[PDB]
Amino acid sequence: GSSGSSGMAPKQDPKPKFQEGERVLCFHGPLLYEAKCVKVAIKDKQVKYFIHYSGWNKNWDEWVPESRVLKYVDTNLQKQRELQKANQEQYAEGKMRGAA
Numbered sequence: 001g002s003s004g005s006s007g008m009a010p011k012q013d014p015k016p017k018f019q020e021g022e023r024v025l026c027f028h029g030p031l032l033y034e035a036k037c038v039k040v041a042i043k044d045k046q047v048k049y050f051i052h053y054s055g056w057n058k059n060w061d062e063w064v065p066e067s068r069v070l071k072y073v074d075t076n077l078q079k080q081r082e083l084q085k086a087n088q089e090q091y092a093e094g095k096m097r098g099a100a
Contacts, residue, residue, distance in 0.1 A: 013042045018049055018069055025070035025080050026051040028062075031091055032080035037069070055095075 009015075018024055018037045026035040038061070039050035047066045053059040070076035084091060 014047055016040045016042070016047045016049065017066060018071070023072045024049075024051070025072055025076055026053070026064050027068040028053070031083045031087060032070075034080075 018040070020037045020040060022037050024035060024037055025032045034054045035051040036054070037049050038052045041048050041050070041063065048063045049066070049069055050061065051064050051069070052061055070080070
């Protein structure tokens with residue numbers, strides 16, 4: 001969407017930043033995990049987004065706020081990577097190795 005940014009809005013719930021289908025980075029602990037915006041809900045005066053952990057299908061999916069999601073941009077990547085590399089073992093723990 002490319003166009004001018006002009007238009008007032010009433011006193012209604014806030015608008016989200018990320019869109020469904022767009023690849024984003026969710027925060028599921030001391031490490032970032034690749035995910036995509038499944039849905040976008042708004043309540044309790046906060047905007048959330050149904051994340052879908054790519055790692056495993058329907059992996060106990062959970063709802064996350066707008067601060068727990070990243071724009072999956074270079075900047076954001078700089079971290080997601082720093083962590084994924086900072087702690088390998090931990091990241092591996094839990095997962096079922098294989099496919100060697």
